Every structure is written in structure tokens, then in C-alpha cells.
């Protein structure tokens, strides 16, 4: 399904805490929407490569090792799944 | 007897198959791989050279200088997405001036 | 004109839609809903016609009579009933020992319907006296046989499940022609189905050797009892090996269309040259059920998973059609000006090819 909900699934305190781990204090109230936008545009490519990889393997489930494989294809590597 | 005319393409297919066989990319390859590669290289080369010719006729010069190729590759957006971290010898750069740096008066 | 080049959305008057077929030139859509009901939608007019409470178990196939007064349905619960197009009730009711695959009406004989029972010979049921006539077959009688008319329905062609195809008469049943399909290189092959056209007497054959072939309904009675297979073009998909489920013929008589199962790859060719011309870009996730073009105008409309996707030629007339003496074009040449600057007493009274699949007589404005 396609639903406009769950996009705001990252409510404000989560971004607050993420900003804190980043090490910032004063964030304007109009940052949240573009953070959602950049997160979505980033996640698009990785999820698309993951689904293409799992489709080519003739199975309709996705593992984690193919996910890290796609992530390494982009350039950002993960350690700790094989 | 030839093999390129079997599909009607122009890029060689025997050359691609030999070069991929000696390129040790794998140990065993199918039959459709060389023709498929010849086809995709054909399509990409045509895509680039059509814009090259358009730029050649832009300045009314028969010969295509690399500046024309640079302009044709850069002005398109999909190419700039695919040719991200690549330069061109003698290529030059497309004209660009920042908007806020434009003096004016009455 | 040429192949369809634009894309159309969906036509879902009701959520579920299993089967679809055009009548003679795409007038009404025969939706067999998966609830035991028979719904009729409107084509080229985007509407609905009639909903029939057939029975409990849903149906899986639909076709209309030659005179358009009947709605035959290959039921999944062996209800061989003659539902009326006009009133919506059942005119004739009968039961068959085996279910039905392909229902068709001979455009010259609506009395004898087309039935494709499984593990048994095809049976023609006569609507005039409710009598069943078994089609004589050869060799086995327990095979997955499919029976189908020709262009005119004058000869009937049957396909078995070992490699044998039979030719006989639609009414006299004089089985005098057979055919043996090629046995590959080492192993034989059965036949899944065949599909015909409305011009040229050509027909596609779908087999179990993953390859779709094409023959003509004129080389079997000409060869005699049985000859050597000789197709025109052994078309197939040699990059993914998609199996074939449903494929029909063109609306002009020169194109061939083939349908995938889940890959959303609808392939097209022409009978003159077996070279691919275009491929359909379908959104993955659904299974294709039925395909059948407009029998006159080039367009494609495939039903799948309760919805329908149409790739078409959407057209609106140009603004320059205000008057023949009025045009709205652009030119840079100087205007070329013009160079050349009864009484009777008679009242006025005057107001592919065509076959006999007409007279639906189903239209309710209110």
C-alpha cells in the first residue's frame, strides 16, 4: 500500500536525540521536513538495490548479507553481518 | 562467415567474446553475453555521438573538437549522474556565473 | 494505425475482475467475478450493463452467443447454463462430467457451443434439444484436450497432451486429418493450447517445450492424414525463459502478441518479420489473466489480479479542426494567395472484416 502516514513515524524527539548525538543545541523548527526528505531519498537507493538483488536470486525475502552487499556497492560499508 | 550481421549491430562481437574470455572475468560464459554487450555499447555510443554531432553543427564546424563532447556530456543530467567523477582532456568547463554576483544600475 | 503507444489507467467498476473478452469490435466486457456472479461492463463507453446471480461457486471463463442472446460461462462448479443477456435469468441448464476450459460460439452455428472438457473428448451441446455430441478423437481419451473453431467455424481443431493435433468438421465430425508435432531433438512435447485469429486462418500453438509456435489452418487438410511439422517462426524469449499462459491474435491480422505470467513482459511481433518492435513496461506484482486486442483498432488491454491495465492510443483532435477553410499552423513562407478569384422535388429518406457475433440487445440507460 501507499499511505501518507508512517512518514511522520520519526516523531520530533527521535530527531532531537539524533541531533544531540551529533552535538548541536539550537535547531530551528523547520528542519524536520527536510530531514525526512533526505532520509527518504537516501533510503530509496539502498532499498531499490536490495530488492533488485533479492529478485535476481529468485527468492522473495531479503536477508542482511545482501543488504550489506548493496551498501558496499554504493560505498558505505557495514561490519558485523558477514 | 561473419557474426556481427547476425543481429544487425555494428560493434564487433567476436572481439568482445575473445577479450572477455581472456579477461578472466569468469571461467565459462554463455552465448548471449557478447552480443548483449555489443548492443549496449552500441546504444551508449550512439547516445553520446548524436549530441556530439548536434554540438558540432551548433558552431557550424564539421570536425568535432573535444569541447563539443564536454558540453554535450555536461549539459545533460543523466550523463552527469553517470559520468560523475570523470574529467576530459582539453575539455574545458561550461559557462556559469553565480546569480547574486551580477551588478546592475539604472 | 501502428501499435499502441500511449498508456491508459484502470477500468474497475467493481473491485474484482477475472476474465475479459471483446464481442466483435469491443462493445461490452464480460467480467466473471470471483463470487459466483456475472458482471457486464461497457467498453468504449466506460460503464456497466447487467449483473447476473448465476450460482454460488465462482466462474472462470466467459463468451457470448452468435446471436448475442446468451452468456455462456465455463463454470468451476460444472454449471453449464445458458444465462440470458436480456432478462439475466437462466434459459438452458445442463451439467457436464468434466469442467470446461474454452467456451466459444460458432459465428455460423450458435446451436453447437464450444466445450473443452478435461480427460475426455470435446462435446458439442445443442441448444435446440439439449443433446450432447462427443467429438471423435484419436489415440487416448483422457488427455488435456482443447477444442477450437477456425475463422468461420467450419472446421474444428483439437489439441491433445502427447503431441497429436486433430482436424475434423464442426457438424459432420469426419475426423480425416491428424498432425504430429516435432519431437525436439530427443524428447517429445505435448500441447498446452492453440489460439486463432479473424483473418488469414493462422493460429498460434503453445506447447510444453517453452516455445510458442505458429501454424496455418490450411496445411493439414492439404497434406492429408499426417505430415511433417513446419512452423513459420519459432518465437520464444531467450533472456528470461518466461512461461506462456494466455496469448491472442492481432486486431488487424498482421501482428502477434504474447503474454507473460509474472514478469510484466508483453511481447509483440509481426507475421512478415519476426523481429521485436516494442515491449510493454508493466509494474511487477500481479498475474496476467486475459489478453485480447480491439478486433479493429490497435490497442492492448490486459486483465490481471482483479484489475485491468490498458496501453492505448489516447487521441484528441487538433485545434486546427475548426473548419476546412480555417487552419492554425505555423509557417515562415510568404502567403500563397488564391489564383482563381438546383430545383427538384425529392424528399430525403437515406440514413478486420465483419462476422456474426452481434445483437447483444443489452443496454439500460436507467
Amino acid at each position: 500500500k501507499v499511505l501518507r502516514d508512517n512518514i511522520q513515524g520519526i516523531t520530533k524527539p527521535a530527531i532531537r536525540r539524533l541531533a544531540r548525538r551529533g552535538g548541536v543545541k539550537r535547531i530551528s523548527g523547520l528542519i524536520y521536513e527536510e530531514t525526512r526528505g533526505v532520509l527518504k531519498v537516501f533510503l530509496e537507493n539502498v532499498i531499490r538495490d536490495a530488492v533488485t538483488y533479492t529478485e535476481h536470486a529468485k527468492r522473495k525475502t531479503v536477508t542482511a548479507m545482501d543488504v550489506v552487499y548493496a551498501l558496499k556497492r554504493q560505498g558505505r560499508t557495514l561490519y558485523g553481518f558477514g | 562467415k561473419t557474426r556481427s550481421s547476425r543481429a544487425g549491430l555494428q560493434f564487433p562481437v567476436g572481439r568482445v567474446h575473445r577479450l572477455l574470455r581472456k579477461g578472466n572475468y569468469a571461467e565459462r560464459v554463455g552465448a548471449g553475453a557478447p552480443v548483449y554487450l555489443a548492443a549496449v555499447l552500441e546504444y551508449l555510443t550512439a547516445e553520446i555521438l548524436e549530441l556530439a554531432g548536434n554540438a558540432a553543427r551548433d558552431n557550424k564546424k564539421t570536425r568535432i573538437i573535444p569541447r563539443h563532447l564536454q558540453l554535450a556530456v555536461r549539459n545533460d543530467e543523466e550523463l552527469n549522474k553517470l559520468l560523475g567523477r570523470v574529467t576530459i582532456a582539453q575539455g574545458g568547463v561550461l559557462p556559469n556565473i553565480q546569480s547574486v554576483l551580477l551588478p546592475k544600475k539604472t | 494505425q501502428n501499435y499502441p503507444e500511449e498508456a491508459d489507467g484502470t477500468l474497475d467498476c467493481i473491485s474484482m475482475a477475472l476474465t475479459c473478452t471483446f464481442n466483435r469490435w469491443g462493445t461490452l466486457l464480460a467480467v466473471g467475478c470471483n463470487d459466483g456472479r456475472i458482471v457486464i461492463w461497457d467498453f468504449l463507453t466506460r460503464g456497466i450493463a447487467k449483473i447476473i446471480s448465476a450460482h454460488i461457486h465462482p466462474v472462470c471463463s466467459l463468451c457470448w452467443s452468435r446471436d448475442g442472446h446468451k452468456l455462456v460461462s465455463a463454470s468451476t462448479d460444472n454449471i453449464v447454463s445458458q444465462w440470458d443477456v436480456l432478462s439475466g435469468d437462466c434459459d438452458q441448464r445442463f451439467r457436464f462430467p468434466s469442467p470446461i476450459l474454452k467456451v466459444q460460439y460458432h459465428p455460423r452455428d450458435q446451436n453447437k457451443v464450444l466445450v473443452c472438457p478435461m480427460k475426455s473428448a470435446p462435446v458439442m451441446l445443442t441448444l435446440s434439444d439439449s443433446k450432447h455430441v462427443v467429438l471423435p478423437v484419436d489415440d487416448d481419451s483422457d488427455l488435456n484436450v482443447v477444442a477450437s473453431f477456425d475463422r468461420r467455424g467450419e472446421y474444428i481443431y483439437t489439441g491433445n497432451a502427447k503431441g497429436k493435433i486433430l482436424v475434423l468438421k464442426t457438424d459432420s465430425q469426419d475426423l480425416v486429418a491428424s498432425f504430429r508435432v516435432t519431437t525436439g531433438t530427443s524428447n517429445t512435447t505435448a500441447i498446452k493450447s492453440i489460439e486463432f485469429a479473424r483473418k488469414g486462418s493462422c493460429f498460434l500453438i503453445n506447447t510444453a517445450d517453452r516455445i510458442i509456435r505458429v501454424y496455418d489452418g490450411r496445411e493439414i487438410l492439404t497434406c492429408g492424414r499426417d505430415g511433417e511439422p513446419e512452423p513459420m517462426q519459432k518465437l520464444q524469449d531467450l533472456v528470461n525463459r518466461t512461461p506462456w499462459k494466455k496469448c491472442c491474435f492481432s486486431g488487424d491480422g498482421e501482428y502477434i502478441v504474447a503474454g507473460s505470467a509474472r514478469q510484466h513482459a508483453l511481447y509483440i511481433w509481426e507475421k512478415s518479420i519476426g523481429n521485436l518492435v516494442k515491449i510493454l513496461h508493466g509494474t511487477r506484482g500481479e498475474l496476467l489473466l486475459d489478453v485480447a486486442w480491439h478486433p479493429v483498432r490497435p490497442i492492448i488491454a490486459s486483465i490481471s489480479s482483479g484489475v485491468v491495465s490498458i496501453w492505448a492510443q489516447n487521441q484528441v483532435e487538433n485545434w486546427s479542426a475548426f473548419a476546412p477553410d480555417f487552419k492554425e499552423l505555423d509557417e515562415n513562407v510568404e502567403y500563397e494567395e488564391r489564383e482563381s478569384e438546383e430545383d427538384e422535388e425529392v424528399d430525403v429518406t437515406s440514413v478486420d472484416e465483419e462476422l456474426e457475433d452481434s445483437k447483444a440487445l443489452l443496454y439500460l440507460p436507467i
Binding site: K1, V2, L3, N6, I7, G9, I10, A14, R17, L18, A19, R20, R21, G22, G23, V24, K25, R26, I27, S28, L30, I31, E34, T35, V38, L39, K40, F42, L43, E44, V46, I47, R48, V51, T54, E55, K60, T61, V62, T63, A64, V67, V68, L71, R76, L78, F81 | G84 | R284, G285
Partner: protein, 97 residues
């Protein structure tokens, strides 16, 4: 407690967090979100609990990095507040316009 000055508890929050090691976005909303977004490319897919988990961390990683960069350019702006134009600046200067 009492109405504290702005940013005062922010410093101790930074100190508590920057040394911490945990997951900041919840689990159920994120898995629901990825299952929702997976529909467009292909419907009716099944996820693995180990898989989706991995994913969020990677995303968080990337996202965290962004803030870092933005913070620095924010200091280059002679202001402490973070503004949208700085996010676009960082995105464009990173090389993925």
C-alpha cells in the same frame, strides 16, 4: 524543575548521549516504514528481523554524519542556530546534488 536557561540541560544531554551506545529511532515504526516503502518496487515481500535491524543503523550512521557536517558549516555562518539552507549546502558540497 525551575525554568532553566536555554541550552543548559542540553550540554548534559550531549554528555550523556555522545558516550552512549544504543538505538535512537524506535523499532516498530521503522520496520513498518520500510515495509510500506518496499511496496512500490515490488509487492508481497518478506523481511528478516536481522536484515531490517542492520538497515536502520546504517541509515542512522549516514544521518548522524550529516549533522556533524552541518554543525561545522553552521559555525562558519557566525550563528549557533541550524538552518535549512545549511543542510542543502552540506548535501550539495558532499557530492550528491
Amino acid at each position: 524543575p525551575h525554568r532553566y536557561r536555554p541550552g543548559t540541560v542540553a550540554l548534559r544531554e550531549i554528555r550523556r548521549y555522545q558516550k552512549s551506545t544504543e538505538l535512537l529511532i524506535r523499532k516498530l515504526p521503522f520496520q513498518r516504514l520500510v515495509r510500506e516503502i518496499a511496496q512500490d518496487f515490488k509487492t508481497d515481500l518478506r523481511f528478516q528481523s536481522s536484515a531490517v535491524l542492520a538497515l536502520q543503523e546504517a541509515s542512522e550512521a549516514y544521518l548522524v554524519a550529516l549533522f556533524e557536517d552541518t554543525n561545522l558549516c553552521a559555525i562558519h555562518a557566525k550563528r549557533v542556530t541550524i538552518l535549512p539552507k545549511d543542510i542543502q549546502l552540506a548535501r550539495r558540497i558532499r557530492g550528491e546534488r
